[PDB]
């Protein structure tokens, strides 16, 4: 306890992330909402936007 | 748990002694790190070994 | 006012003993990186201290 | 006073400027100049150079 900053101790955790190329398994609070077609609307497909 | 020189070196393309010894990142790494201090958790007057 | 100027010459540095010595936080270096401070070769060195 | 330094109480003061579009009001000790005509001179006028 005696040494200064810069020895001091330090956890540290790590996340790490995959982006896609796989169904989903991980997902925020975001609550879905039933689909509709033949209309232009803006979509968000698993944090896919357009 | 590390010391406090070797929060910089856990970085994508980062060489050094933690880094390319016990804990390697790859270049195109894509998440987040954490740090935080730990004096009252893991030290000890005797030394903690 | 009247920092010391000391003049490094004719030897060899091994930096990776800097930290050792004194609770710093990190190198905060310009034009090179203490990273790969140890492969190059230099001409003179200066340290002050204040 | 035994929490974390993640947690501890910060106090913060923040500065809001507006740049210009109104007479100039808050600035310092810096001496003024009488003016002169009809000679290629270096301007300063409420903090604008030229």
């Known amino acids: 306890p ?18 896609l190329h796989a169904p989903a398994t991980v997902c925020g609070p975001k609550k879905s909402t039933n689909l509709v077609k033949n ?4 979509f968000n497909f698993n944090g896919l936007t357009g | 748990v590390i010391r406090g020189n070797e929060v910089s070196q856990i970085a994508p393309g980062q060489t050094g002694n933690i880094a390319d010894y ?4 790859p270049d195109d790494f894509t ?17 903690n070994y | 006012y009247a920092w010391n100027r000391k003049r490094i010459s004719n030897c060899v540095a091994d930096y990776s003993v ?5 609770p710093f936080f990190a190198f905060k270096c310009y ?6 401070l140890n492969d190059l070769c230099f001409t003179n060195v200066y340290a002050d201290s204040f």
Chains 1, 4 share one sequence.
């Open chain 2, 22 to 25: 016990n804990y390697k990142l």
């Open chain 3, 18 to 22: 800097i930290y050792n010595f004194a």
């Open chain 2, 31 to 47: 998440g987040c790190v954490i740090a935080w201090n730990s004096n009252k958790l893991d030290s000890k007057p005797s030394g």
């Open chain 1, 2 to 19: 005696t040494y200064g900053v810069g020895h001091q101790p330090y956890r540290v955790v790590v996340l790490s992330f995959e982006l």
């Open chain 3, 31 to 36: 034009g090179v990186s203490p990273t790969k």
């Open chain 1, 39 to 42: 209309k232009c609307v803006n």
